[PDB]
């Protein structure tokens, strides 16, 4: 009566499992998760990567707290180069990037970068891969697309926790905002979805969901 | 600025989407979900199918309520043939099965069948496919196995709801009981798992999870 | 260095890429691949597992074969119990099975078992998993079904290899016979398919195909 | 009837199994498949998309080609803007792109664009998705990576077809060159792999392979 399974070695992305180590000035673990990066933006010019990058420091000032410090320093340097310390959940490394906030690049905001304050540890894990999408499903109507989209978070009206299925029944009548990364645009976007367990198809979204090493946002072979 | 997606037709299992219709004597929608069926058991001899079958009626007596009616009728007919009306979430049809409860078949109980009272609508949907399993993960240690196992429910100490991810953080210290169907044994079994977000790998279980039409319990082509 | 990937351990089935073993009494690697096992058959009664079992010996006689020896020993013991040595690609072990061939069981053959002569090494690898299936596709019409079906072989002449894609080009207009395992019936069947690159959908079959550890025939956790 | 499956609608990409179209000025189906596009290149500046773009015309001249016409028109307008007609297998549309070939951009070629002459119909189909990759496998050593890599072609002589499996048998001992798209870099690269059936793991590459709608190169929702 022995196991019919054994162990084998496989390649996995470096930004998985237990990270040794972190090397973060300021010593914190939270920072500003870079989500959407607009076209022709200072954030773009600075090479901020959607989903993978975290702004952890500006001009030497560590960003441990969810306040107005980052927004004030940008507002105080509106056309001047600013230095940012960037943490990558992909390379697990820190890099210095120059960025110049501006009102003159024609988009919304001073960075052209949508951010959210959160922790960057196991942030490469909390990803839900959109698989198949039924016709006329809530997922379809909201703009979710099969296989190209990965759900990476939500605008949390109400509060509970973070895993995905644990939101869509609780928003059974109310619209839900989702953070959706796309592997063609390599960018996040806002999707507003109206969950319905009785829409007339699978689940409350009408789409499949994958989680795990088979369902992560892709990474290049080399740094 | 038009959609890069269109609609195409694909084959899906009949026991999906919206069922027309139900045809259930007694008119209810709840019944006894057949889980584990033991070897050489009356339940086996009667052809009860794990996961797909629901006991809805016994000797004409409809089982709408989660009480002792079923257990008493079996106990009152301990070596006599009993008639059961069976609903299949696979065929969406009703069938009559003869079953003879007994103390003499050598196993545990009178049917050799583990059951749970619940609803049989969209019951083919609430399935979580175990994908990859890391070495020494909580999933590994509990007995979950890659690709062959499908999580179909839990013994719900505490209460919340039914989707899977919405349990494993709340049992961060306490063991969790899972109902696990296996596509080799075609049978359910009890798995006790100790969720840990800090075990040193992906998620709290250390396994991948698939949900949807790509991650259902398989069905034969024809009835 | 610069690689963004590392190595991690995962559970995989015992019957995997490690080329072991043989250790077969009589010496060899070839035997009789058990495909279809009919209901209510002597073969079923003997516990022969479709796809996983290989008949290696009958009454001490090694089957280095593909002649009439097997059908002749069964004919000579036509209603008497015979000993078979069985090899399992699942357990990687040999077992003795008793089976009683008969003229009386009403089905085809003396065992009710469809068999084929071949080698049993890496036979758990040689499997193509049917993924999605388009409507009105060649796959659909032939009877292939999404996710429940695994193509485990074909009629091999010209001799070639065993590969599936390099079969669909040479049968670009006339039908191909496929051996298809279904994880619900736990049994093989013959599917005749007519490849057509211009049917009006993906490929020549109109179905997706998976290969590898994510796409094998499922295995129970314990022997 | 007896079928346990039915039909359902799902979203799929526009560039799918429906054989449309052509409607190409100059008439044809062949052109220059844009593979690698180098960083800081005239080609990059012109917005040429790796894998999805086909160069069909330069300055009104149709490329029914695979001769030196393209390299010659680029040489004759060596630092001047030229008009290119581009076909997209993603949008199924034609667009005019301006590009200025140069001797001065420091990279290889006048465009910094690796190209190949072929037909653009069902080219979104001819993709093999790399799934899991074993350690020390041929796939690993050559540089193939799990889930982020898609094999989109090979060096085609003998002429054959384009298929991947029926390439790995004929290069059973000497190396094979593969064109590999990565969904992080959004770019192609050359991978040289040495197939070995006895490397000591699954298949001859040591990786899983997916084919079909579940395994295509991702597409953005809108054009």
UniProtKB/Swiss-Prot annotation, chains A, B, C, D:
Subcellular location: Golgi apparatus membrane; Endoplasmic reticulum membrane; Golgi apparatus
Region (GRASP): 30-223
PTM comment text: Myristoylated. Myristoylation is essential for the Golgi targeting. Palmitoylated.
Domain of life of the organism encoding this protein: Eukaryota
Disruption-associated phenotype: Mutant mice have normal weight at birth, but display growth retardation and lower body weight during postnatal development and in adulthood. Females display normal fertility. Males have normal mating behavior, but are infertile, due to defects in spermiogenesis and acrosome formation.
Domain (PDZ GRASP-type): residue spans on this chain: 30-120, 126-214
Tissue specificity field: Detected in lung, heart and testis. Colocalized in a polarized fashion in the acrosome region with JAM3 in round spermatids (at protein level).
Modification Dimethylated arginine occurs at: 45, 62
Residue span of region Important for membrane binding: 209-214
Lipid tethering residues (N-myristoyl glycine): 17
Family affiliation: Belongs to the GORASP family.
Subunit-structure text: Homodimer. Homooligomer. ER stress induces phosphorylation-dependent monomerization. Interacts with BLZF1/Golgin 45. Identified in a complex with RAB2 and GORASP2. Interacts with JAM2 and JAM3. Interacts with members of the p24 cargo receptors. Interacts with CNIH and the cytoplasmic domain of transmembrane TGFA, prior its transit in the trans-Golgi. Interacts with KCTD5. Interacts with TMED2 and TMED3. Interacts with SEC16A in response to ER stress. Interacts (via PDZ GRASP-type 1 domain) with core-glycosylated CFTR in response to ER stress.
Known role: Key structural protein of the Golgi apparatus. The membrane cisternae of the Golgi apparatus adhere to each other to form stacks, which are aligned side by side to form the Golgi ribbon. Acting in concert with GORASP1/GRASP65, is required for the formation and maintenance of the Golgi ribbon, and may be dispensable for the formation of stacks. However, other studies suggest that GORASP2 plays a role in assembly and membrane stacking of the Golgi cisternae, and in the process by which Golgi stacks reform after breakdown during mitosis and meiosis.
Protein name: Golgi reassembly-stacking protein 2
Phylogenetic classification of the source organism: Eukaryota, Metazoa, Chordata, Craniata, Vertebrata
Name of the gene: Gorasp2
